[PDB]
Amino acid sequence: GSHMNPPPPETSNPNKPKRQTNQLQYLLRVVLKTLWKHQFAWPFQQPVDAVKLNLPDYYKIIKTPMDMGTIKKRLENNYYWNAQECIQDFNTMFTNCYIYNKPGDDIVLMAEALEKLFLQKINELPTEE
Ligand SMILES: COc1ccc(Br)cc1OC
């Protein structure tokens, strides 16, 4: 896309050790699957295109971008070593939204609905085996 958007977060790096865990499998098959199909998922299914949205300050304010398209790639391409890394990515995505946008803006209500579902699912994250 535009040279004015940053490169997306890393999704592939052979130097980073990878592992499948039951908790990572749950994050893909339960957590990502649940949030991805939500009515309000669409603004979070890819990196924020600050050029198209006419938000030239977006990447001035948000220095740790994350989105569910990136997370889906990271889970599908086994990028992670543990569940905490992936949970951290979800939390970063929500916090980016809450930092950039006014409370009660539509995008914030959409993030909050996805976060409520996320919390319910993560409370049920299985014991690591
Ligand atoms: C937070 O800034 C945004 C503005 C517009 C859309 Br669509 C998505 C955004 O973030 C996920």
Please spell the DSSP secondary structure of 12-43, one letter per residue. Answer: --TTS-----HHHHHIIIIIIHHHHTSTT-GG
**Domain CATH for 104:** 1.20.920.10
The answer to whether position 89 is within a domain reads yes
Q: Is the C-beta atom of 59 inside 6 A of ligand 1?
A: no
Distance 128 CA to ligand 1 centre (A): 34
Q: Which of 107, 81, 68, 71 is nearest to 23 (CA)?
A: 81
User: Cα(55)–Cα(53) distance, rounded to whole angstroms?
Assistant: 6
- Resolution in A for the shown PDB structure? 1.2
The answer to whether position 46 is within a domain reads yes
The answer to whether position 1 is within a domain reads no
What method was applied to determine this entry? X-ray
Q: Do residues 104 and 65 make contact, with C-beta atoms less than 8 angstroms apart?
A: no
Q: Which residue has the tokens 């951290």?
A: 88
The domain tally of the chain equals 1
The answer to whether position 41 is within a domain reads yes
The answer to whether position 15 is within a domain reads no
The answer to whether position 98 is within a domain reads yes
CA 83 to chain centre: 13
Nearest CA to ligand 1 atom 1: 97
Angle 53-55-59 (CA atoms, 0-180°, nearest 5)? 120
Residue 47 sits in which domain range? 22-124
Q: Which of 122, 13, 9, 121 is nearest to 77 (CA)?
A: 13
